[PDB]
Each structure stands twice: as structure tokens, then as C-alpha cells.
Design a protein around this ligand. Sequence first.
Ligand SMILES: [Zn+2]
Ligand SMILES: [Zn+2]
Length: 266
Amino acid sequence: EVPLPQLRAYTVDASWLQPMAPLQIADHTWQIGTEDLTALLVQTPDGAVLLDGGMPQMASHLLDNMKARGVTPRDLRLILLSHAHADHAGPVAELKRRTGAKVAANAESAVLLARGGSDDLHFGDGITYPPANADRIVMDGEVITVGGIVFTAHFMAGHTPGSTAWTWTDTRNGKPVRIAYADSLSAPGYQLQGNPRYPHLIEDYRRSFATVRALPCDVLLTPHPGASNWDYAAGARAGAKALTCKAYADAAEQKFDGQLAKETAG
Ligand SMILES: [Zn+2]
Ligand SMILES: [Zn+2]
């Protein structure tokens, strides 16, 4: 007699769960997640913004890094997301419970967040996390202003329907730095062609490559730092090899075309 399988936890490479101290990106922007998952803290006279949180178990670590930076729980005002998968929005519910923070997201991201990533178009219930609800729904190109830092949403559907790039301008060595936090452009294990749950997947990815190519982009960051050739563990040279937005888009498109060809052959 054979039981049903046990539930399988969402396990990841150790580096994704390896805590790091805050790594400064620009004057008010810091990487505060793990070595291999981005979680960006933007500090303002008017409160802090967090872009992504990483995995569900990262909440306390994030709060510790925030504290190191002079940001108390009450100080966190806003949470923004690249996309609502467990490896990026994992600790949002907990952060909302433990801080002042409100979440802004597009409708697709909000619906996926509210189901804790369950019934994923591709993953089913394989990769889930505690559900959270959005406080504010944003539209494509909508801005959110926090202490004169303007964050702009750029939809780039594909990896998830609600995938978003967030752009803002910080400063460094006395000059403006246009930061582009571009979402994932991967399609890991996805059925790309004739997917009944996502009929226009290919078209969306193609538009998203073009969107990423054109972002205002002095510095690119990505949810998985490796995708943009960041090495958070490399200290002073963490961002030295970072791709441009143009190079990131091109690499992703070339990879996508390869995947299409292999799928046709499979
Ligand atoms: Zn994802
Ligand atoms: Zn991911």
C-alpha cells in the first residue's frame, strides 16, 4: 500500500538564504536581502520603501538590516514587488503584520499575492507562501512618490502576468543615478506555445523584452542578482560587472528564442 506523497517544501540553493549586511547601491538605496535574492531598501526623509523581500523566512533578517540602517518597523511605509512568487514576495504578509508598511501592486500581482502564489499559471501549488493583500492598485506607468523619490511602474508581463519593472532616480558621487529594478525575464519550465492558461504568453514576453531595453537605466538590478551579473558577495565590486538593461533584455530574448526552439523540438 502506497500513501499519497508528502507535501514538498519549496527548497532553494543555500546562497538564496545566506544573510548579508546592507550593501549600498546609491546614496539612499541598499541591498538588504541575501547573497542571491534582492530586497532593496530605499530610504527617504519621509519613510522607507522596500522593493521585494525574497523568501518567506527572510522577514526577521530584513527587519534586522532595516534596523542597522536606522529604519524602525514604523518607518517602513511601502512595499513594492517585482512579481508575486515565493522567492520575492515570500515575507510580505509577515512584514505587513510587523511594520507600518502598505503594499502597492498591479491587479495581476495583487490577485496572485492574495492567493499566496497558489494556482500559479505554471507552478500550480508547488511554490506558495503566506497570502497578503495589496493596499493600493497601480496602473502601467503610474508613479508613487515617497519623499521626492518618484517610483515608476513599467509592466513587463511574462514571467508572471503582473511582472513589473520599477524605476527611480537616486544619486551617487554627486550625480543622478537612474536605477532600473527590472523583473525576471525567465520562463523556467514554462509551456510557452499554446498555453491555455496564458494564450498570449509569447507576445507578452516579446513586448517585455522591448520594455526592458528602453528603461531609464544607469544601473540595472534584478530579483535574482545573477540575471544582471551582480555579485552581492563581492563587496566593493558587487555591481562592477552588471549588465545594462539593453544587454539583459537581449540575453533574455536569446534565451527565450532557444527555449521556443527546444519546446517545438520536444
Ligand atoms: Zn518568479
Ligand atoms: Zn524568482
